[PDB]
Design an enzyme around this catalytic site. Structure first.
Site, short mmCIF file in Angstrom:
data_model
loop_
_atom_site.label_atom_id
_atom_site.label_comp_id
_atom_site.label_asym_id
_atom_site.label_seq_id
_atom_site.Cartn_x
_atom_site.Cartn_y
_atom_site.Cartn_z
N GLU A 31 8.80 61.69 77.02
CA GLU A 31 9.78 61.20 76.07
C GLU A 31 9.35 61.43 74.62
O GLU A 31 10.19 61.61 73.75
CB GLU A 31 10.06 59.72 76.33
N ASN A 37 21.56 63.26 67.07
CA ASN A 37 22.55 62.21 67.31
C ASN A 37 22.44 61.71 68.77
O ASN A 37 21.89 60.62 68.95
CB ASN A 37 23.95 62.63 66.86
N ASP A 96 25.41 61.45 70.49
CA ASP A 96 26.49 60.45 70.38
C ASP A 96 26.22 59.51 69.19
O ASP A 96 26.47 59.90 68.05
CB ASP A 96 26.66 59.68 71.71
N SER A 115 23.28 57.58 67.65
CA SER A 115 22.22 58.13 66.80
C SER A 115 20.86 57.68 67.31
O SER A 115 20.72 56.55 67.74
CB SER A 115 22.38 57.70 65.34
N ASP A 160 16.99 58.09 69.06
CA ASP A 160 16.02 57.40 69.92
C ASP A 160 14.72 57.21 69.11
O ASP A 160 14.22 58.16 68.49
CB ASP A 160 15.78 58.19 71.21
N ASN A 184 16.88 54.17 72.40
CA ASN A 184 18.18 54.42 71.76
C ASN A 184 18.73 53.23 70.96
O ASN A 184 18.79 52.08 71.46
CB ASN A 184 19.21 54.82 72.84
N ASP A 212 17.51 45.31 82.81
CA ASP A 212 18.98 45.33 82.78
C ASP A 212 19.50 45.30 84.23
O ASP A 212 20.44 44.55 84.52
CB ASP A 212 19.51 46.54 81.95
#
Ligand SMILES: [Cl-]
Length: 118
Positions: free
Chosen positions: A35, A43, A45, A47, A49, A56, A92
């Site tokens: 990563e 971006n 989408d 903006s 990371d 993100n 999550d």
């Protein structure tokens, strides 16, 4: 701060990620590698990371932020807020599959090889 593998492995164990929500230390070390290449400041989408886990902003930080921190706090030489936000993220309900690079590269492999040699 760009870390090394063992340095990083030790920091993550320190902040209590070895077998967190089920995931052994390697999974984490493996994810930081693909990563960010272990770069603590990194971006399409929304903006941006941020950091070594490349968290993100659309969701997790503000640059309604879910982890309850600024996005600047994902950039320092220590990895502490990163790891806290990581800890919320992975619970999550989708686990480490949140991280794309983890799903395509680390999931299923020998991930303990990332903590061998340290
Ligand atoms: Cl899980």
């Amino acid at each position: 701060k760009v870390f090394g593998r063992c340095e990083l492995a030790a920091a993550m164990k320190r902040h209590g990620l070895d077998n967190y929500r089920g995931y052994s230390l390697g999974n984490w070390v493996c994810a930081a590698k693909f990563e960010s290449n272990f770069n603590t400041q990194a971006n399409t989408d929304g903006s941006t990371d941020y950091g070594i886990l490349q968290i993100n902003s659309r969701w997790w930080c503000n640059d309604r932020n879910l982890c309850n921190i600024p996005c600047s706090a994902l950039l320092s030489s220590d990895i502490t807020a990163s790891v806290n936000c990581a800890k919320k993220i992975v619970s999550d309900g989708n686990g480490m599959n949140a991280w794309v690079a983890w799903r395509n590269r680390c999931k299923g492999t020998d991930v303990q090889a990332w903590i061998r040699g340290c």
